[PDB]
Amino acid sequence: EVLDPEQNNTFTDHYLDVPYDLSKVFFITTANTLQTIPRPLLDRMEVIEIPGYTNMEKQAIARQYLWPKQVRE
Amino acid sequence: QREYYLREQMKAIQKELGGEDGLSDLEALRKKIEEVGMPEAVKTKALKELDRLERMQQGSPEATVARTYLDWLTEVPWSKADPEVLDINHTRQVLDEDHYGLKDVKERILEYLAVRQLTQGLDVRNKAPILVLVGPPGVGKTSLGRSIARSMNRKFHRISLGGVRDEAEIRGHRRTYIGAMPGKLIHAMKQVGVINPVILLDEIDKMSSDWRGDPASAMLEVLDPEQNNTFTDHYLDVPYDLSKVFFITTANTLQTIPRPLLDRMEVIEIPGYTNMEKQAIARQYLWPKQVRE
Amino acid sequence: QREYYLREQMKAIQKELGGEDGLSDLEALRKKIEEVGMPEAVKTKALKELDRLERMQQGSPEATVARTYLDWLTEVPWSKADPEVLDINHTRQVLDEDHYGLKDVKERILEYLAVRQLTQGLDVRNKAPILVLVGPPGVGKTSLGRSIARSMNRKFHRISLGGVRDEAEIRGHRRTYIGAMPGKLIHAMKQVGVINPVILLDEIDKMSSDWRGDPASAMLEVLDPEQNNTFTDHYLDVPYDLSKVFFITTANTLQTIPRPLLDRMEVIEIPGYTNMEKQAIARQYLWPKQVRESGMEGRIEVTDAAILRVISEYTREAGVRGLERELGKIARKGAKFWLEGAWEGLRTIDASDIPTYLGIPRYRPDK
Amino acid sequence: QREYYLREQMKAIQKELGGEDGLSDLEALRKKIEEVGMPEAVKTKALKELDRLERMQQGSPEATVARTYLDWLT
Amino acid sequence: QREYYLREQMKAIQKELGGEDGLSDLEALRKKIEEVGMPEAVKTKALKELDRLERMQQGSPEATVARTYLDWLT
Numbered sequence: 001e002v003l004d005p006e007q008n009n010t011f012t013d014h015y016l017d018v019p020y021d022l023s024k025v026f027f028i029t030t031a032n033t034l035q036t037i038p039r040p041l042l043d044r045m046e047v048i049e050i051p052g053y054t055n056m057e058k059q060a061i062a063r064q065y066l067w068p069k070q071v072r073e
Numbered sequence: 074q075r076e077y078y079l080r081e082q083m084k085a086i087q088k089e090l091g092g093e094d095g096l097s098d099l100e101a102l103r104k105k106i107e108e109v110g111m112p113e114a115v116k117t118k119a120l121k122e123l124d125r126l127e128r129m130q131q132g133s134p135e136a137t138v139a140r141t142y143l144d145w146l147t148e149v150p151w152s153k154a155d156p157e158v159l160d161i162n163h164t165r166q167v168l169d170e171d172h173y174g175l176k177d178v179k180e181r182i183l184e185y186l187a188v189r190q191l192t193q194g195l196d197v198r199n200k201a202p203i204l205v206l207v208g209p210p211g212v213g214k215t216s217l218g219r220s221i222a223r224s225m226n227r228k229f230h231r232i233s234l235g236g237v238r239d240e241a242e243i244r245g246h247r248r249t250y251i252g253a254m255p256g257k258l259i260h261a262m263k264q265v266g267v268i269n270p271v272i273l274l275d276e277i278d279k280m281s282s283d284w285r286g287d288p289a290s291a292m293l294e295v296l297d298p299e300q301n302n303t304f305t306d307h308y309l310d311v312p313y314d315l316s317k318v319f320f321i322t323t324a325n326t327l328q329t330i331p332r333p334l335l336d337r338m339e340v341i342e343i344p345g346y347t348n349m350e351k352q353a354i355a356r357q358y359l360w361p362k363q364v365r366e
Numbered sequence: 367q368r369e370y371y372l373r374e375q376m377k378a379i380q381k382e383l384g385g386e387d388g389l390s391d392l393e394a395l396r397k398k399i400e401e402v403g404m405p406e407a408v409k410t411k412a413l414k415e416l417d418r419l420e421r422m423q424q425g426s427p428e429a430t431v432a433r434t435y436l437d438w439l440t441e442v443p444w445s446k447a448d449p450e451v452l453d454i455n456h457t458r459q460v461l462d463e464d465h466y467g468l469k470d471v472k473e474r475i476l477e478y479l480a481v482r483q484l485t486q487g488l489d490v491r492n493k494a495p496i497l498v499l500v501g502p503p504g505v506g507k508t509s510l511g512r513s514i515a516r517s518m519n520r521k522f523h524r525i526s527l528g529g530v531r532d533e534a535e536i537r538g539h540r541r542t543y544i545g546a547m548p549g550k551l552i553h554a555m556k557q558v559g560v561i562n563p564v565i566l567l568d569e570i571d572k573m574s575s576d577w578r579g580d581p582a583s584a585m586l587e588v589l590d591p592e593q594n595n596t597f598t599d600h601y602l603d604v605p606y607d608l609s610k611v612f613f614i615t616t617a618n619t620l621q622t623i624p625r626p627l628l629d630r631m632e633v634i635e636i637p638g639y640t641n642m643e644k645q646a647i648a649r650q651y652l653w654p655k656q657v658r659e660s661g662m663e664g665r666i667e668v669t670d671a672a673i674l675r676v677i678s679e680y681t682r683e684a685g686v687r688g689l690e691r692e693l694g695k696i697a698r699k700g701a702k703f704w705l706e707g708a709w710e711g712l713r714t715i716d717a718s719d720i721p722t723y724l725g726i727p728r729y730r731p732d733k
Numbered sequence: 734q735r736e737y738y739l740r741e742q743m744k745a746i747q748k749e750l751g752g753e754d755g756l757s758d759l760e761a762l763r764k765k766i767e768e769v770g771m772p773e774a775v776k777t778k779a780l781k782e783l784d785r786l787e788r789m790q791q792g793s794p795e796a797t798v799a800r801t802y803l804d805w806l807t
Numbered sequence: 808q809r810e811y812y813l814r815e816q817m818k819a820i821q822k823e824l825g826g827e828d829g830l831s832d833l834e835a836l837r838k839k840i841e842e843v844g845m846p847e848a849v850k851t852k853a854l855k856e857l858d859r860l861e862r863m864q865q866g867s868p869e870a871t872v873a874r875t876y877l878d879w880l881t
């Protein structure tokens with residue numbers, strides 16, 4: 001009910017007996033596999049797969065982000 | 074002369090300690106009970122508990138309980154209804170404006186209207202359908218409910234039963250308790266103004282069911298096609314008829330519905346679309362929507 | 367002190383509602399208490415609570431509690447019963463008008479009536495059996511309650527126990543609370559006017575438990591025929607007799623009924639219907655009521671072979687809700703065909719015209 | 734009579750703290766219930782709950798539920 | 808003497824707001840304890856939970872708990 005992209009204009013919990021509007025809120029959900037998400041819940045979300053890094057972009061991350069941070073701390 | 078002079082004295086005592094109520098709106102409740110619906114046993118017990126509020130004094134914490142019971146009892150509709158639409162062609166037009174395909178559901182609605190045309194007063198039973206729409210996760214069977222409700226010129230209200238686990242959400246709590254009020258059905262019948270709504274029960278196959286909470290066995294006598302004209306709440310203790318309510322329920326599978334609840338409902342399969350149907354849906358419903366937005 | 371003075375004059379006016387408030391109380395209820403006919407200990411408790419409903423003033427929150435407890439104690443039936451039937455042939459003829467088949471249940475009811483009519487002098491008898499109807503969904507369990515109650519010329523009341531979780535529905539709350547109502551059983555006894563109704567307790571196998579106990583423990587008190595003659599709720603502080611009530615209960619399976627309840631019950635199983643039984647109850651019961659409700663009577667009919675087609679090739683069940691949904695579908699299609707051009711007389715639906723009305727068959731017959 | 738005068742004194746204290754302040758509670762909630770941009774179908778429920786609240790007892794076990802509900806709405 | 812003097816005052820007040828001995832309680836269920844059993848520790852405990860029902864309000868929930876307790880212990 002909270003992630004339905006057509007019907008979350010009217011979300012109703014049990015304490016507030018009124019419909020509340022959740023259509024403007026930017027949801028970002030995080031997972032690490034898709035197999036344990038039930039199929040009606042997976043259909044409501046847009047998938048973006050982040051694959052894992054190669055060695056030269058690991059070098060770029062280590063030069064530009066990780067090593068100055070570990071030096072300052 | 075003497076008895077209405079006695080009324081003059083009690084009026085003097087009342088308005089010198091008047092609350093702008095206690096004689097200003099108790100008799101408004103007296104007028105409002107008698108003018109709206111309310112079969113005879115209900116109005117007898119209602120006037121019985123109306124004449125035993127007047128000697129509470131608000132300054133009576135049980136005066137709140139009785140007045141809120143009366144205001145749940147008078148604002149739930151009794152015999153107020155929307156007419157049936159006779160233009161079956163106009164209903165066909167409005168159903169074709171919203172969705173592509175889906176001939177089975179549309180023919181079900183048009184046959185309901187054809188039956189309601191041939192009964193223009195015959196003293197027969199008027200029993201509204203109880204449906205379950207079953208299909209794959211993407212096929213539109215939630216938007217179809219309010220498309221039906223707009224095409225028939227009826228009122229619409231949606232209830233989500235997706236994670237509901239307690240029985241106090243279908244029926245209420247008793248009037249004894251501090252903050253009690255009825256279940257979602259009586260509240261939905263109060264939000265809607267009539268006795269002919271289209272109530273979408275959003276997913277009927279996802280209710281929790283164990284030895285510590287099973288609402289799926291309290292949905293029996295809500296969806297019973299023979300006995301839901303005497304549905305009894307726990308807050309209201311009068312029998313209240315739900316036999317005129319057009320209930321549409323939705324599910325993705327039939328295996329997780331309890332078997333005494335499944336055969337209460339007429340099952341309409343919605344199978345999933347072919348490539349020509351998806352091309353037509355994409356041409357005249359989805360692409361103009363995305364281009365506008 | 368002004369407002370004390372003012373409703374002091376109001377209660378002095380209440381001494382002269384009609385020249386007195388007595389007719390509404392000491393003379394309302396003192397007339398109503400022996401107008402009914404009530405036992406002696408409850409008469410003692412009623413008189414020596416009207417003794418202090420006498421003394422107090424109206425309006426104050428200690429008089430409304432006592433007055434509602436006196437009003438609820440006056441309108442519960444004490445020693446008033448419907449007459450007993452002495453002709454079991456009339457009971458057999460009434461039971462055969464509402465249902466078809468179901469021979470063992472009907473003859474068990476006739477055995478109970480014969481036992482109670484032959485035995486009215488030894489005073490161990492006349493404990494009514496706690497009947498349990500067990501079967502698949504769709505067989506006539508719930509309808510037999512009203513059919514049996516019409517057969518014995520008694521009054522009927524149905525209580526649904528499908529999702530009852532609180533124990534305060536069976537046995538109520540004490541009348542010292544700010545809101546106070548009795549249980550559902552004594553409310554049902556107020557609904558009927560007699561001491562011997564037929565109470566249908568529907569779906570006893572589906573009661574839910576909670577903390578503060580489960581309502582099966584409170585249900586065991588009323589449904590045990592050796593302790594239900596002194597049944598005590600908490601609203602009424604007195605024992606009440608519920609031994610003359612004929613209880614009928616329904617269930618779908620036995621494995622979820624509590625063990626101290628199954629030891630006091632006599633199960634009667636309803637097996638499910640064969641095809642000849644299904645077409646008999648479709649000729650006699652389902653098809654006329656599906657044609658009346660469509661407004662198509664005198665305009666469309668169906669043969670026996672067509673009903674056998676509908677049973678064999680479109681249903682797989684034990685009950686008959688699906689069969690009447692199919693017959694209602696045929697009546698709807700006829701009602702829609704009527705509006706797009708009428709006919710005279712009545713057309714008769716044959717077994718070769720069924721796929722026009724119901725579509726492609728969904729089960730294949732054996733050959 | 735002494736403690737009657739005591740409770741009557743403290744009731745006189747609470748009905749005017751500074752100049753007024755006796756009714757800053759429900760009148761401030763009446764202001765706040767219309768300063769926010771609620772839909773009308775929620776405003777009707779809120780005003781009916783507040784009118785049902787204003788007859789009650791200040792400090793009842795049945796008043797704090799309604800006041801907490803109105804606070805969650807505001 | 809002081810027992811039936813102060814209870815004589817109990818009687819003389821309860822006679823008009825109660826029409827003579829009220830409820831048959833409060834003097835002779837005091838005598839029903841000595842005619843059944845009992846160990847003396849049980850007897851003094853019964854007298855202690857008996858004498859707390861003396862002035863406590865009739866129509867209150869705690870009194871009924873104490874009432875059924877001393878009636879079932881009897």
Ligand SMILES: Nc1ncnc2c1ncn2[C@@H]1O[C@H](COP(=O)(O)OP(=O)(O)OP(O)(O)=S)[C@@H](O)[C@H]1O
Pocket residue numbers: 006040171172173174175209210211212213214215216217324325354358
């Ligand atoms: N035939 C159709 N014509 C037009 N729009 C359609 C059609 N079928 C589906 N849609 C659209 O598809 C979307 C999904 O509809 P939903 O009713 O939400 O599907 P749903 O089956 O109810 O999802 P769940 O997971 O089963 S609750 C909606 O925006 C519909 O408008």
Ligand SMILES: Nc1ncnc2c1ncn2[C@@H]1O[C@H](COP(=O)(O)OP(=O)(O)OP(O)(O)=S)[C@@H](O)[C@H]1O
Pocket residue numbers: 299333464465466467468502503504505506507508509510618647651686687
């Ligand atoms: N032998 C029969 N003769 C006539 N009508 C019957 C017969 N058996 C069943 N029916 C009808 O079948 C319908 C279903 O009856 P019910 O008693 O409500 O079923 P049920 O056994 O109570 O089902 P559940 O799921 O346990 S509530 C009613 O309309 C009955 O009139």
